[PDB]
Every structure is written in C-alpha cells, then in structure tokens.
C-alpha cells in the first residue's frame, strides 16, 4: 500500500530510495532543485 508523501545526486531512483516518496513527487522535487525518463547530465 501507499504511505509515501511529498513532504520532507538528484537521480529519481536514488532520491526515491533516500526519501521514500512517490515517483511523481520525486520528479517534482527533482524539478524543485534543478529549476519518458531522460539521459542523465
């Protein structure tokens, strides 16, 4: 079941492992810091 939340290496997978979040909000936080899947910089 789902218990992760948007509340609180910008890699989606690594940050999701580090913070236990949904993948949509994980890419949200990726956008929050930087500003289907992409090749990495």
């Amino acid at each position: 079941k789902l218990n992760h939340a948007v509340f609180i290496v910008i890699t989606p997978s690594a940050i999701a492992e580090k913070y236990k979040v949904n993948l949509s909000v994980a890419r949200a936080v990726i956008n929050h810091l930087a500003d289907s899947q992409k090749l990495y910089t």
Partner: protein
C-alpha cells in the same frame, strides 16, 4: 568507438572463470548501441553464445502472461535498469552485470547422480533465475520491476541473500550433498 546507449563501451572487464568469457562473448563484432539486432542463432552451436549477454536478457526477461511478446519495452527496461545500477552502485553497470551472470549460475545439478553444468547452461540458468526473480519481484512487491532489477542484480553480484537466483542455486547445489 561505439557507445552502449551512448554511454558504455565496456573497455575493462573482470576475469571471472575465463570460461564464461567465451559464452558471454563481449567483443567489437557484438558491440551495439542497443540490443534487438537482427542476430540469428538457428544454424550452429556458437552464435547463440556469440549473441551479447545484453541481448540475452532483453529477450529472456520478456515472458509473463500477457506481457509476452513485448521486446521494445524490454530494451526500454534494460536501458533504464542500467541507469539505476551505476547510480545506486559506484561500479560499471555492465561490469556488475558480468559479475552477476558469472556468480549466478549453478555449478552443478543432479537432474538424474550429480552432474556438472556446461558454461552454456551456466549462463542460461543464471539468466533464467534472475529473470524469474524479476517476475516475482515485480508481482505483489509494491516496488516497480525496474528498482526490483536494480536490487536483484546487486543482490546476486555481491552475494546478498535477497536474490532469488542465489537461493535457488543453493537449493540446486544442495541436491548434490544428498546424491553425490
């Protein structure tokens, strides 16, 4: 020269047992940007082993029920998976890949009385066992199959009990302790 997914060229590999090397067959002729070339295997005994191990997974993890017969998405999942391997771990994705395929094969199995495994089936059962770890680690596991892969290849390559393939290898070796 070439670049696997515009990233990798696997210019350094591990020794392993030096026997699985000919089976894994990483070389320039088999070098390719993405798997799913027009490679053919239906003539002799080598070219199935000639085919790159990357293709040997992009064509072997594919089976699950309806999910059968979708291979472009198999290249998709392997492309993403290689991302996550080198991201969650500091080693080359293909290097830890070779490590996993080397140390994920059963060294023996009775199968009617124990009998050693040829390197072909050593690679074969390694691939099969990791892919059937992937399926039941994608079913009823909360996490997605991509992160399941990122967990299982490291689990099998570093000798971590979480990999299904290593547990099955131990079970398959255990039959020797009763027969041979």
């Amino acid at each position: 020269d070439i670049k696997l997914f515009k990233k990798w060229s696997y210019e350094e590999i591990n020794i392993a047992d030096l026997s699985l090397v000919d089976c894994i067959a990483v070389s320039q002729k088999a070098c390719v940007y993405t798997p799913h070339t027009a490679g053919r295997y239906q003539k002799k005994r080598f070219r199935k082993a000639l085919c790159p191990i990357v293709e040997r997974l992009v064509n072997s993890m594919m089976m699950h029920g309806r999910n059968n017969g979708k291979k472009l998405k198999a290249i998709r999942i392997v492309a993403y998976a290689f991302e996550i391997i080198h991201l969650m771990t500091g080693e080359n994705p293909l290097q830890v890949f070779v490590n996993a395929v080397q140390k994920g094969g059963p060294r023996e199995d009775s199968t009617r009385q124990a009998v050693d495994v040829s390197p072909l089936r050593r690679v074969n059962q390694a691939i099969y066992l990791i892919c059937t770890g992937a399926r039941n680690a994608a079913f009823r596991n909360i996490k997605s199959i991509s992160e399941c892969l990122a967990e299982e290849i490291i689990n099998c390559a570093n000798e971590s009990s979480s990999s299904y393939a290593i547990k099955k290898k131990d079970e398959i070796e255990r039959v020797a302790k009763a027969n041979r």
